[PDB]
């Protein structure tokens, strides 16, 4: 289809680098024809679930906005990029609403994201006083206070730094290998639709 204004899914999925999950990255998609054929034609998708819409129907639907959130987590953790999950990631890193509408796409990125003797570039949040509300982002690096004793900006007993690095050796079992995740969230307000499939 020869279109003039086409949504940048290419830019989202084919980015060279991806955010740490704690500091997940969001791109807004608006006022463009969304061709999801470029997702269908991927061989490489390990996970491709949609919530509230059939993946086979995306090219038929209009939305007010689409939001492309992206990040890197463990293979073991993709499970948590779903409505109503718990775990370090879902709880403290990236939470979806219980009534989420969108797709979660993930692929093994061992090839790009692991370095021999570890790639310590990728971080996730290990401690937080509460859980995240849906689509909340926490990038603060305040030393986590466990005890009733203040931490005074330094580390120690009951005073731990809230971010941990993933290992990411090339030799890790699939479960511990890095996966790149894209979360398309379809947003439907009482406004004109700006993002429509070609159908």
């Amino acid at each position, epitope marked *: 289809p020869n279109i003039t204004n086409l949504c940048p899914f290419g830019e989202v999925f084919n980015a060279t680098r991806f955010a740490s999950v704690y500091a997940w990255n969001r791109k807004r998609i608006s006022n463009c024809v969304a061709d999801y*054929s470029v997702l*269908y*034609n991927s061989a490489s998708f390990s996970t*491709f*679930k*949609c*919530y*509230g*819409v*059939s*993946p*086979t*129907k995306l*090219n038929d*639907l209009c939305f007010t906005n689409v939001y492309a959130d992206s990040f890197v987590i463990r293979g073991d953790e993709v499970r948590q990029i*779903a*409505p*109503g999950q718990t775990g370090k990631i879902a709880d403290y890193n990236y939470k979806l609403p*219980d*009534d989420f*509408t969108g797709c979660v796409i993930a692929w093994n990125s061992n090839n790009l994201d692991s370095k021999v003797g570890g790639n310590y570039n990728y971080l996730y949040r290990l401690f937080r006083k509460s859980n995240l509300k849906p689509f909340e982002r926490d990038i603060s690096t305040e030393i986590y206070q466990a005890g009733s004793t203040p931490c005074n900006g330094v580390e120690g007993f009951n005073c731990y730094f809230p971010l941990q690095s993933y290992g990411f050796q090339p030799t890790n079992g699939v479960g511990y290998q890095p996966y790149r995740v894209v979360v398309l969230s379809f947003e439907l307000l009482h406004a004109p639709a700006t993002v429509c499939g070609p159908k």
Partner: antibody
Amino acid sequence: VQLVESGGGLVQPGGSLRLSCAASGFTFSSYDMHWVRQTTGKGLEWVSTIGTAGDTYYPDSVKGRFTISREDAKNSLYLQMNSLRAGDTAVYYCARGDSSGYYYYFDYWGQGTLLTVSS
Amino acid sequence: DIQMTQSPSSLSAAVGDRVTITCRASQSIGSYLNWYQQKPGKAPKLLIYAASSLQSGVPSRFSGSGSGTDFTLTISSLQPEDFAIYYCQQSYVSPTYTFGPGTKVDIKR
């Protein structure tokens, strides 16, 4: 609107078999098609979805072993099964998918075709 | 996954009675719920989609209700041919649609 499965029979463990669905009475190319199996105890199980844009979808149980395909010009749908394990033994239904709004459902099923993996 | 449980597994009622059968998603799924009827030796038939919409051609005695986590199919006035296994199917998370174990409705002659 009809769907008629064929291909079901006995097959060797580790063996291979290709199911076929013959659709009539509707614009085949317009609708997603699916395979759903049914087993003793373990109820109805979704096996495969093919969209209308060459998108195909599988559950892990079957991923890498089964390939769904369609020949829209021959009003036909196919399930190519490899490395058939024992527990792949089921009745296999070919089903049409459709959505009213965001709401998806299997709106027409075949008559079923029985596959038996056994030595 | 999302897993469906139906209750009860067996049911008996005479023609004319009101049968009510339950389905329960393992997490909230809004009105993303379908009901299928399967007479023995036949393929499933769609009764209800979107928790509560009657499929074209389905008798109006059949009804669906509920949303979120708990769901009800109700045959208001049972008939002799309504003897079947009834299956609920969540349609929130795709493509991995999941079905319930099934409820068998017997007739009291």
